[PDB]
Design a protein around this ligand. Sequence first.
Ligand SMILES: NC(=O)c1ccc[n+]([C@@H]2O[C@H](COP(=O)([O-])OP(=O)(O)OC[C@H]3O[C@@H](n4cnc5c(N)ncnc54)[C@H](OP(=O)(O)O)[C@@H]3O)[C@@H](O)[C@H]2O)c1
Ligand SMILES: O=C(O)CCC(=O)c1ccc2c(c1)OCCCO2
Ligand SMILES: [Co+2]
Length: 159
Amino acid sequence: MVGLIWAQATSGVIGRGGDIPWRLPEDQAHFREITMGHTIVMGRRTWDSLPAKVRPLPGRRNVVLSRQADFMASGAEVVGSLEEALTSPETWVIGGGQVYALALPYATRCEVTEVDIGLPREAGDALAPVLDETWRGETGEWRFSRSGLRYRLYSYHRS
Ligand SMILES: NC(=O)c1ccc[n+]([C@@H]2O[C@H](COP(=O)([O-])OP(=O)(O)OC[C@H]3O[C@@H](n4cnc5c(N)ncnc54)[C@H](OP(=O)(O)O)[C@@H]3O)[C@@H](O)[C@H]2O)c1
Ligand SMILES: O=C(O)CCC(=O)c1ccc2c(c1)OCCCO2
Ligand SMILES: [Co+2]
């Protein structure tokens, strides 16, 4: 099982300036629950976005995808191809935009947090991947984050 997990604005923006223009504590707990115990695969830029005191994320096989053969990610594995990282029963791709696109052929689940924030796409933004007709979606109710933004969870899946 390869799954993708991400939060996006209604516009599809997931990242800007190397970070994320919101923060939902409820989404971070949801992320931790879904990924805990499993492999997490991330692009090098997303590894960079994590503070050093946070990496690796605890209780998970942290895998960083990079083309630099000497890139050092302390506490993590660095692989040069996505296929290298798929040696566990559950693998969650945690971003960012480039790695979601690379991983989507392998994926049968997307746990998507839609954040009710009006955020026009700008040059250089990272974007959510486009899900084609093979994906079946189930939606939750709109909920209020304590940060003041509404959000809702979509669970997409396909055989
Ligand atoms: N909203 C969310 O839920 C969420 C979650 C995660 C990240 N984000 C945001 O997304 C943004 C980063 O996403 P990004 O698309 O800019 O970069 P990214 O996907 O996180 O990492 C890009 C890097 O991955 C490596 N890479 C990409 N394709 C590869 C391949 N085919 N083989 C080997 N290595 C490969 C390269 O690393 P080298 O350059 O080292 O080769 C590339 O520079 C940040 O803003 C981050 O905050 C958002
Ligand atoms: O998982 C934990 O241990 C606590 C929450 C956390 O560390 C976290 C939550 C969301 C993330 C993230 C980390 O980095 C990946 C890119 C953005 O999505
Ligand atoms: Co689990």
